[PDB]
Design a protein around this ligand. Structure first.
Ligand SMILES: O=C(NCCCN1CCC(c2c(Cl)cccc2Cl)CC1)[C@H]1CCCN1Cc1ccccc1
Ligand SMILES: CCCCCCCC/C=C\CCCCCCCC(=O)O
Length: 281
């Protein structure tokens, strides 16, 4: 209703201001402030960049929720949709890259450099483009019934392609990346078992454990924020459509929840990363 969507939009504004502030801070700290351009932090920079873009979309989506239609036209319609998908894919792919980096650090403790991680970020945005660009072409703001709206157009017959795109996007933007991550940390367990102050100098081992913890928590927070949406959107692809005030409300709030993940990221760095913790204040 009117007041409940006022809640949604106010939530967006909060996530928008705090998220842009935090992620811009992080990007600044890594970029110029210090030669702390480590592999993990270059990947973190990638995350903050994607968060920045989607955060920039939050005000526009907010007005759409209020008015009940899209009053910004096709250009910004395709721009927004593109950013959204780019966000999901670059996020999961970057998290996977961080997890593989951690695993290599444990297996080969005795050659990871910012230049290679920068290259990985490039490849991440290229694959993301494989889905980001087509959706931008497909997405449009059209007046199907009663009102104009921004939507991604599913080809005819929708009953076939809907499930196709639903299952494929579900697997490849979510299940498979998370799956790889699971393999990485499980293998790290097998290797780590029975090792105390092993495969390193004392001081370094402690730092490695701290970074591994950080990556793990970031993954956990992300998966926790986007799993409800992922399941619901999958169900929507299969034809399962919400048709009650409560159903719509639940959906709106779970979508919001994922956007909250965008702003959550700098706080996690501030509490679980010593360098960042020093840099805030
Ligand atoms: O409903 C909107 N935005 C909600 C976007 C939700 N987004 C939809 C795609 C979701 C996604 C993605 Cl991009 C990738 C993999 C899995 C999943 Cl579930 C992630 C959540 C309305 C508000 C203004 C125009 N329109 C934006 C829109 C953004 C992306 C796709 C379709 C519409
Ligand atoms: C997605 C691409 C993931 C492959 C990149 C490996 C990351 C390990 C590293 O270079 O530190």
């Amino acid at each position: 209703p009117l007041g409940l969507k006022v809640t949604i939009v106010g939530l967006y504004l909060a996530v928008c201001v705090g998220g842009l502030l935090g992620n811009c801070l992080v990007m600044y700290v890594i970029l110029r402030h210090t030669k702390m351009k480590t592999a993990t932090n270059i990947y973190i920079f990638n995350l903050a960049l994607a968060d920045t873009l989607v955060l920039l979309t939050l005000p526009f989506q907010g007005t759409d929720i209020l008015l009940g239609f899209w009053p910004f036209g096709n250009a910004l319609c395709k721009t927004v949709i593109a950013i959204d998908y780019y966000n999901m894919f670059t996020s999961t792919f970057t998290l996977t890259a961080m997890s593989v980096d951690r695993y290599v650090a444990i297996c080969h403790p005795i050659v990871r450099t910012s230049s290679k991680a920068q290259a990985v970020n490039v490849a991440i945005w290229a694959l993301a483009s494989v889905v980001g660009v087509p959706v931008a072409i497909m997405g449009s703001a059209q007046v199907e019934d009663e009102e104009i709206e921004c939507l991604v157009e599913i080809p005819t017959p929708q009953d076939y392609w809907g499930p196709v795109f639903a299952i494929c996007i579900f697997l490849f933007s979510f299940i498979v990346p998370v799956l790889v991550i699971s393999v990485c940390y499980s293998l790290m367990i097998r290797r780590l078992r029975g090792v105390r102050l092993l495969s390193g100098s004392r001081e370094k081992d402690r730092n490695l454990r701290r970074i591994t913890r950080l990556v793990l928590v970031v993954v956990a927070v992300f998966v926790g924020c986007w799993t409800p949406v992922q399941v619901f959107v999958l169900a929507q692809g299969l034809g399962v459509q919400p048709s009650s005030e409560t159903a719509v409300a639940i959906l709106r709030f779970c979508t919001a929840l994922g956007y909250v993940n965008s702003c959550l990221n700098p706080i996690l760095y501030a509490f679980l990363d010593e360098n960042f913790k020093a840099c805030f204040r």
